[PDB]
Paper text:
Transcription factor (TF) IIIC, a six-subunit protein complex with a molecular weight (MW) of 624 kDa in humans, facilitates transcription of type 1 (5S ribosomal RNA) and type 2 [e.g., transfer RNAs (tRNAs)] RNA polymerase (Pol) III target genes. TFIIIC is composed of two subcomplexes, τA and τB, that bind two gene internal DNA motifs: A-box and B-box. τA binds the A-box with low affinity and is required to recruit TFIIIB to the promoter DNA. τB interacts with the B-box with high affinity and, therefore, is essential for target DNA recognition of type 2 genes. hTFIIIC consists of τA subunits TFIIIC35, TFIIIC63, and TFIIIC102 and τB subunits TFIIIC90, TFIIIC110, and TFIIIC220. TFIIIC220 forms an integral part of both τA and τB connecting the two subcomplexes via a ~550–amino acid residue flexible linker.
Our cryo-EM analysis yielded a high-resolution structure of human τA, which, however, remained in the DNA-unbound state in the presence of the tRNA gene. This observation is in agreement with biochemical studies on hTFIIIC, where the TFIIIC2 component interacts exclusively with B-box and is deficient in interacting with A-box. When inspecting the 3D reconstruction of human τA, we found that 50% of the cryo-EM density corresponds to the τA subunits TFIIIC35, TFIIIC63, and TFIIIC102 (τ55, τ95, and τ131 in yeast). TFIIIC35-TFIIIC63 form a heterodimer that binds the C-terminal TPR domain of TFIIIC102. Unexpectedly, the remaining ~50% of the cryo-EM density belongs to the C-terminal half of the τB subunit TFIIIC220. The C-terminal half of TFIIIC220 forms an integral part of human τA, suggesting that TFIIIC220 links τA and τB with a ~550-residue-long linker between its N and C termini. Whereas the N-terminal WH1 to WH4 and eWH domains either directly or indirectly (WH1) mediate B-box recognition, the C-terminal WH5 to WH8 domains form an integral part of τA and, thereby, serve as a hook that tethers τA and τB. A potential reason why we captured human τA exclusively in the DNA-unbound state could be due to posttranslational modifications that may regulate the affinity of τA to the A-box motif. An alternative explanation is that human τA mainly did not bind the A-box due to the absence of TFIIIB. Once TFIIIC is anchored to the tRNA gene, the τA subcomplex, connected by a ~550–amino acid (aa) flexible linker to τB, will search for the A-box motif, separated from the B-box with a variable distance between 30 and 67 bp, by a fly-casting mechanism.
Residue numbers in the entry:
A (entry chain D): 419 to 449, 456 to 598, 604 to 886
B (entry chain A): 1262 to 1483, 1495 to 1598, 1669 to 1819, 1976 to 2109
C (entry chain F): 14 to 82, 89 to 113, 120 to 127
D (entry chain E): 10 to 96, 103 to 189
């Protein structure tokens, strides 16, 4: 029909570098590809809003045309934001119908990618995460379920949005007709695996910056369950680092330990591992490191970090006798360290604390001389004079503790940046331990003075 | 696992009360916690959760809360208030001690006790009146107050009998510590000459007070008299704070031993027995491991002042089996005084430790003064002239005379210090043509000894011309007359203090060492039986002039009733027109060194402490 | 004419009473008198308590039990600087003031 | 003197007291140190645990104060001094209510542990903040684990013991 000839004439306009005559030409036909020729002529012309309106009729006439679907929304985004630009990014394809709609899942993944950029550029962070999670679910659900992780939606955020959850094995627990590899083949036609890695990165980042660190950890564990990245040990290490970072920052210290234990055992001497491993095992209730620290110390008897750290475990177990030798042997290697001169001078005070009395003075002066080397190494500080106060409080020597605390109140906080002044400030703890001294001494008024002025917070 | 709860806790507290009462029958009247545990199971079958061991600790965990501890004490008092619930338990002289009767009587007593203390109220039926006035008009209303409920201390009663009594209370103790050598060196007749100045009534009163509180034990030898009694084991229990007396003087003995090495700037060093080839020419004092406990506190304090340096020589083997998975070789150390204090240590707000005098002469005149009212011209004119040759304006002269007039008017009684300060609070400010403050004016009258701080139950000032009954009159050894304030640590002859009694002052430091920050009204009342309470302040006055003790004050808190909010502050006692009465005390950083230097390490008075 | 609200949250704590369930049961009579005086009186199931006001040394922070559909949880509810320390009284029809035996 | 006032004694739900050692200017700042309502409720769920007060809750290396839980019989009494002035004279009337029964009190009695700030001291005595380093506070592995930095390894708790020992320069034969 004439529409074919007029479309050829419409192409003949572009063969002379013209677009605007498509508008009369279409107006002679209508009373689709002709609306697309008209819409894209309007896009080559300045009439971007009329192009979008014409693309509206295209999408109304041909909603399956992915390029029109994208073009309408992207032009609406170009015309403004927020201006209902995410409309006409509806896939309208059904998860039961994937026996054929797996082909349409190519469009769905492409649409979700585009939609994700509109959400991200708008700042609808939760909706952006929803597109990322749905895409990653389509990619990786065959491991999330093996991680016993599933996807749900709820209004708990104030609107119906998606979240990851663990599922109980009583409900759900840890490739027919080649469907999984067909899904893999069609979806890898959109995104190469490095973009699946980029999706992993983007999702983890967005989950972290949304403070949904718990769900990032669930995604990480599911991604570690994804063998086809877990087999790339560089990716695995990077996932482990994210998994550790999330499990630290959500305070799931039990889950954090399971990661940091692996990294340390592979790199027995890097300091910025041991610095983190210590605090994870400090906040976690799990005792499991005690046997682990024996195994690694027997593995690496020279290792200074373990030599002190194994001392911490025995000292925490109350076996001050065997603990001390591991601090002192550490101190032989790094004598100008306040912590090791502290931990030894503190250990002899634990020993002197016990019910036995034998030569107890010799243990105390061996205790307090090593604390003087701590103080001398550390310099005059709130920390330095407090800790000798508490050390002399533990032994009940409160005729000396009282002056170590008063000195620490008269001395201003450790200024260095990174944490706010009232959080470096020990004024509270030392006013409290004085308030315990004063309360125990029957002086409520002086205890009250301290809590009113120093402990107002 | 075990989970205790309010129900079993309450019954256990009753079993604790029953245990406390039945401890008066048999020491450890329970056969084992089983007897309680049976009552627990019999009352609460869920006590199958709980072991007999858990009972033995739970009976000691709960008492950690003062409110629950007070709840125990009040209910125990409400038991002890009525003999009828205990008499048949306590009065039995037969069946006194066997496990079956002890078990049976314990259960029976607790079963009876559960009739007095019960989950539903004894009497929910009572009529109770409409308001406080109606309440007291109808009912006598009574409750258990705390054993600490008291008012502040106050001036004692008006009689010369009270003046005699409040000196005699410690003249007796000035005998009780004397050895036979003192009883010979100041002979029996010479102390009888002293005691016969005081009436038998107040003597019986003072001895009864001492005897009633078990402060006195009968002497064995082969009115009160020196041969009659001595400081009881419990009297020493008053002063025998857990710190053994020897520490402080042993801690000076360490310091004085240390001066044998002189002084040096050598930093501390920590070194291997593996490096015996490296030595500081061995010029350091070796520490006596398991030396007397003063060797421990001396190093602890000298570290804190930054005034000592140490060679801690430790081998490569503190641990004999160190290679094992799972014997302490305690290790030698050597010391030397520093030349100069380490930077920024706890500078003691006091004279340098080397500057001190290391002798008994350091004790203030308070402990050695002799008073002599005849030492100066009787006429006020001499003291007016002394103030006229001082900087005093005539406004200060009449102000001083205005202050003096009140004190001389009371005769043998004295104006208490706080009464005087209120009455002449207008003289505080030194304005209005004054040049002197009230405190300077009264201090001048005291220092020019028109006045004496004769004390009593609280600080009172009296005219020097009439202070006599507040002072002991005695003689030095043929003899010469002397007069002094009576104190337990002063010699009956008045000529001297007793250095062996100053274990009282060593104990006083150990008191404030055990309870640093103790408020004065609790410290002074603690000695309520033993020490005439002003004498507690003079020991505190002493230790502060030695530098061992620091006084501090708070301004008195306004009552917390009726939507008030506490005026909670420290103060520096600036004023009388507004008060600052709550003084409290702290030890100073070096009190053991500052005290020990004063006293020779002679054998302590404490030997009676053996059971 | 004029009316105004003034308030304070006095925490009351009771003593001289053991193995009790009074607070669960006593509501049948529950009365307070002299509340603004120095020694207010509490009548409770016709038990009678007397005491003095005291400052809390710390702030006493009071939380309410709450339930999730069951599991117990807490919510913050109050804080108070001020507290009332109480002792069970004894009565006999006979005068002024509660006698406290030291 | 006015008559006794009848009081609505709710008995509605029990109340739990935390004797917080401080003066609470604003509850939004106090509650984080107890670990919040989530924290104290979890510690109310198991009486073998102890309530831990972190006086410096922004710092991971804050070793906490520990509570002892106790039973008690207690009530929260809201007084309402319904004040008036009336023809004219000022007047006062009372309303009051007892909001609940306080069965339980947490008292802080264990002294604050030893505490060691996140600052290294080089042998030259200069202080270096690891708070810029070890806090992991930016989630993208802010503490890059292989970096050359000081070892900072405080023991999990610097003491097991929060009460003073009976030692007073005292030996015994035992």
């Amino acid at each position: 029909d004439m529409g074919d000839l007029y479309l050829d004439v419409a192409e003949a306009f572009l063969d002379v570098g013209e677009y605007n005559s498509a508008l009369p030409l279409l107006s002679a036909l209508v009373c689709a590809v002709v609306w697309l020729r008209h819409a894209e002529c309007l896009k080559a012309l300045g009439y971007m809003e009329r192009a979008a309106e014409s693309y509206g009729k295209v999408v109304d006439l041909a909603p399956l045309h992915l390029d029109a679907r994208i073009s309408l929304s992207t032009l609406q985004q170009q015309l403004g934001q927020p201006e209902k630009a995410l409309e006409a990014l509806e896939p309208m394809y059904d998860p039961d119908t994937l026996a054929q709609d797996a082909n349409a899942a190519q469009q769905e993944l492409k649409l979700l990618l585009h939609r994700s950029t509109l959400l991200f550029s708008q700042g609808k962070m939760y909706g952006y995460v929803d597109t990322l999670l749905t895409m990653l679910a389509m990619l990786l659900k065959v491991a999330m379920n093996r991680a016993q992780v599933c996807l749900i939606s709820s209004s708990k955020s104030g609107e119906r949005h998606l979240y990851l959850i663990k599922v109980s094995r009583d409900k759900i627990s840890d490739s027919a007709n080649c469907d999984a590899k067909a899904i893999f083949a069609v979806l890898t036609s959109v995104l190469t695996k490095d973009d699946w890695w980029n999706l992993l990165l983007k999702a983890i980042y967005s989950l972290c910056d949304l403070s949904r660190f718990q769900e990032a950890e669930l995604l990480v564990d599911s991604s570690l369950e994804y063998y086809s990245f877990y087999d790339d040990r560089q990716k695995r290490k990077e996932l482990e680092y994210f998994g550790l970072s999330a499990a630290i920052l959500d305070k799931n210290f039990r889950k954090a330990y399971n990661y940091i234990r692996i990294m340390v055992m592979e790199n027995v001497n890097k300091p910025q591992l041991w610095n983190i491993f210590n605090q994870v095992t400090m906040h976690s209730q799990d005792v499991r490191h005690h046997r682990f620290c024996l195994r690694l110390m027997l593995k690496n008897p020279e290792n200074h970090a373990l030599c002190v750290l194994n001392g911490h475990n025995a000292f925490v177990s109350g076996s001050f006798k065997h603990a001390l030798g591991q601090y002192v042997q550490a101190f032989r290697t790094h004598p100008d360290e306040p912590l090791y001169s502290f931990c030894i001078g503190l250990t002899f005070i634990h020993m002197a604390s016990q019910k036995y009395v034998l030569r107890r003075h010799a243990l105390i002066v061996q205790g307090f001389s090593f604390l003087n080397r701590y103080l001398s190494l550390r310099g005059p500080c709130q920390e330095s004079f407090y800790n000798l106060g508490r050390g002399l409080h533990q032994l009940g020597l409160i005729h000396l503790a009282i002056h170590y605390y008063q000195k620490a109140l008269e001395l201003p906080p450790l200024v260095v940046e990174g944490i706010e002044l009232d959080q470096l400030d020990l004024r509270r703890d030392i006013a409290y331990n004085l308030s315990l001294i004063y309360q125990s001494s029957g002086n409520t008024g002086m205890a009250q003075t301290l809590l009113y002025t120093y402990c107002s917070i | 696992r075990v989970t205790w709860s309010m129900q079993e806790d309450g019954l256990l507290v009753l079993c604790r009360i029953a245990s406390n009462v039945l401890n008066t029958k048999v020491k450890g009247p329970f056969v084992t916690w089983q007897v309680v545990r049976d009552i627990l199971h019999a009352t609460f079958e869920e006590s199958l959760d709980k072991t007999s061991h858990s009972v033995g600790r739970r009976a000691r965990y709960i008492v950690k809360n003062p409110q629950a501890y007070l709840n125990y004490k009040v209910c125990l008092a409400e038991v002890y208030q009525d003999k009828a619930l205990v008499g048949d338990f306590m009065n039995r002289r037969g069946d006194y001690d066997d496990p079956k009767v002890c078990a049976n009587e314990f259960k029976e007593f607790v079963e009876k006790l559960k009739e007095k203390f019960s989950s539903a109220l004894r009497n929910s039926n009572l009529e109770i009146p409409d308001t406080l006035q109606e309440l007291f008009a109808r009912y006598r209303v009574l409750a258990i107050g705390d054993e600490k409920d008291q008012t502040r201390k106050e001036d004692e009663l008006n009689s010369v009998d009270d003046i005699h009594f409040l000196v005699l209370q410690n003249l007796i103790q000035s005998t009780l510590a004397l050895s036979d050598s003192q009883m010979k060196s100041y002979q029996s007749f010479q102390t009888f000459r002293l005691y016969r100045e005081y009436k038998d009534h107040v003597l019986v009163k003072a001895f009864m007070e001492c005897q009633k509180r078990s402060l006195v034990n009968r002497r064995r030898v082969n009115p009160f008299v020196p041969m009659s009694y001595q400081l009881s084991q419990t009297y020493y229990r008053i002063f025998t704070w857990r710190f053994p007396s020897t520490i402080c003087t042993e801690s000076f003995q360490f310091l004085d031993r240390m001066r044998a090495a002189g002084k040096l700037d050598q930093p501390d060093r920590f070194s291997f027995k593996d490096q015996d080839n490296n030595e500081p020419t061995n010029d350091m004092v070796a520490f006596s491991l398991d030396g007397p406990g003063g060797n421990c506190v001396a190093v602890l304090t000298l570290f804190s002042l930054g005034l000592i340096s140490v060679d801690v020589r430790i081998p490569e083997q503190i641990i004999v089996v160190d290679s094992s998975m799972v014997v302490v070789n305690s290790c030698q150390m050597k010391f030397q005084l520093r030349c100069t204090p380490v930077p920024a240590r706890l500078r003691p707000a006091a004279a340098p430790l080397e500057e001190l005098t290391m002798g008994t002469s350091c004790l203030p005149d308070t402990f050695t003064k002799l008073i002599n009212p005849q030492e100066n011209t009787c006429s006020l004119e001499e003291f007016v002239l002394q103030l006229e040759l001082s900087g005093y304006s005539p406004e200060d002269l009449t102000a001083a005379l205005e202050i003096l007039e009140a004190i001389i008017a009371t005769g043998c009684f004295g104006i208490d210090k706080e009464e005087l300060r209120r009455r002449f609070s207008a003289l505080e400010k030194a304005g209005g043509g004054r040049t002197r403050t009230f405190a300077d004016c009264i201090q001048a009258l005291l220092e020019q000894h028109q006045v004496l701080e004769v004390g009593g139950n609280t600080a009172r000032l009296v005219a020097m011309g009439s202070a006599w009954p507040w002072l002991l009159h005695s003689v030095r050894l043929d003899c010469e007359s002397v007069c002094f304030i009576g104190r337990p640590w002063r010699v009956v002859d008045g000529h001297l203090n007793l250095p062996v009694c100053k274990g009282m002052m060593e104990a006083m430091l150990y008191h404030i060492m055990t309870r640093p920050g103790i408020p004065e009204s609790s410290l002074l009342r603690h000695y309520q039986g033993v020490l005439q309470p002003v004498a507690v302040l003079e020991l505190l006055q002493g230790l502060e002039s030695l530098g061992c003790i620091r006084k501090r004050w708070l301004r008195k808190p306004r009552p917390v009733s009726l939507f008030s909010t506490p005026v909670v502050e420290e103060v520096e006692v600036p004023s009388s027109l507004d008060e600052s009465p709550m003084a409290f005390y702290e030890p100073t950083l070096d009190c053991t060194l500052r005290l020990g230097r004063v006293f020779p390490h002679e054998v302590n008075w404490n030997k009676w402490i053996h059971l | 004419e004029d009316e105004e609200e003034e308030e304070q949250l006095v925490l009351v704590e009771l003593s001289g009473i053991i193995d009790s369930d009074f607070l669960s049961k006593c509501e049948n009579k529950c009365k307070v008198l002299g509340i603004d005086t120095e020694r207010p009186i509490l009548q409770v199931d016709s038990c009678v308590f007397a005491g003095e006001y005291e400052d809390t040394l710390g702030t006493c922070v009071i939380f309410e039990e709450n339930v999730e559909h069951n599991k117990t949880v807490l919510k913050y509810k109050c804080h108070t600087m001020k507290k009332l320390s109480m002792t069970r009284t004894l009565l006999t029809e006979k005068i002024g003031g509660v006698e406290w035996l030291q | 003197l006015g008559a006794a006032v009848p009081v609505e004694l709710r008995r509605e739900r029990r109340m739990v007291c935390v004797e917080y050692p401080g003066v609470v200017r604003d509850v939004a700042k106090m509650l984080p140190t107890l670990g919040g309502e989530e924290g104290v409720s979890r510690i109310y769920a198991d009486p073998t645990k102890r309530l831990e007060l972190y006086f410096r809750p922004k710092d991971p290396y804050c070793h906490p104060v520990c509570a002892n839980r106790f039973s008690t019989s207690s009530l929260l009494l809201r007084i309402r001094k319904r004040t008036r002035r009336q023809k004219a004279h000022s007047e006062v009337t009372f309303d009051m209510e007892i909001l609940g029964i306080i069965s339980t009190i947490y008292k802080f009695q264990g002294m604050s542990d030893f505490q060691y700030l996140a600052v290294h001291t080089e042998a030259g005595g200069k202080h270096t903040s690891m708070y810029d380093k070890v806090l992991m506070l930016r989630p993208e592995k802010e503490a890059f684990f292989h970096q050359e930095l000081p070892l900072y390894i405080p023991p999990p708790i610097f003491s097991r013991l929060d009460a003073p020992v009976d030692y007073f320069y005292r030996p015994e034969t035992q």
